Amino acid sequence: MNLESLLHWIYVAGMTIGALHFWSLSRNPRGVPQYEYLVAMFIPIWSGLAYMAMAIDIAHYARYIDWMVTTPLLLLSLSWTAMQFIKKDWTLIGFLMSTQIVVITSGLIADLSERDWVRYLWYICGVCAFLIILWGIWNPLRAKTRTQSSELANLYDKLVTYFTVLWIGYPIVWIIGPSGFGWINQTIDTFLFCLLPFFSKVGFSFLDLHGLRNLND
Numbered sequence: 001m002n003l004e005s006l007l008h009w010i011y012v013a014g015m016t017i018g019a020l021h022f023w024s025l026s027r028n029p030r031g032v033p034q035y036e037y038l039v040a041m042f043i044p045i046w047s048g049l050a051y052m053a054m055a056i057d058i059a060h061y062a063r064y065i066d067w068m069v070t071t072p073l074l075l076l077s078l079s080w081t082a083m084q085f086i087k088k089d090w091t092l093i094g095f096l097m098s099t100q101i102v103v104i105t106s107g108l109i110a111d112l113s114e115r116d117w118v119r120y121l122w123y124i125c126g127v128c129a130f131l132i133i134l135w136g137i138w139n140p141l142r143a144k145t146r147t148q149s150s151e152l153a154n155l156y157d158k159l160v161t162y163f164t165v166l167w168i169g170y171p172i173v174w175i176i177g178p179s180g181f182g183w184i185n186q187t188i189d190t191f192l193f194c195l196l197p198f199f200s201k202v203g204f205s206f207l208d209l210h211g212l213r214n215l216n217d
């Protein structure tokens with residue numbers, strides 16, 4: 001077992017603990033609907049399975065297969081919170097989810113590209129779709145909370161801020177690593193793509209679920 005495998009196994013352990021915790025919280029919902037708990041559970045499970053595949057075995061292909069599903073689901077979770085006490089705007093949710101999938105597919109194509117100018121154009125395409133995502137969660141999605149209690153609005157603002165900071169790190173690590181300029185080696189790249197995802201998946205859902213539950217103290 002090399003360092004990369006070890007890092008991936010620790011990540012899998014993290015996902016497992018996270019999943020078990022959300023499952024336990026769902027048994028005592030405290031005012032939060034089960035669908036929010038189920039998505040919170042599915043995300044780390046899907047990611048953990050993907051990383052388990054890499055731990056056992058372009059490089060890190062499965063990481064893109066993880067993001068393909070988990071990123072749109074994280075937006076689904078974020079969207080539900082924004083519309084916690086109102087009717088779910090499914091068209092807005094679909095827009096955000098599909099647009100995020102474009103981010104991931106653009107990233108994969110870029111990584112699969114043989115020509116550097118082509119690779120970077122697709123990277124740019126992904127960043128543009130990503131900017132649309134940021135615009136979405138900060139405007140139309142954020143506006144939804146303003147039609148509700150200030151308590152919800154304040155919770156959403158903290159979550160979307162946490163959400164945004166972490167998400168911005170992904171295109172950064174990608175471009176500085178082997179898929180980009182190569183300022184960092186694969187191992188360091190892997191290490192960063194273990195920490196960020198842990199806080200983005202388990203970390204975000206922890207703050208999201210506990211935040212929603214706490215509003216009902």
Ligand SMILES: *C\C=C(C)/C=C/C=C(C)/C=C/C1=C(C)CCCC1(C)C
Pocket residue numbers: 066067070071074103104106107108110122123126127130167170171174197200201
């Ligand atoms: C595993 C969980 C999350 C929230 C992963 C998010 C990943 C991204 C936002 C990735 C973005 C990329 C961009 C914007 C540009 C091309 C390369 C990436 C796919 C790394």
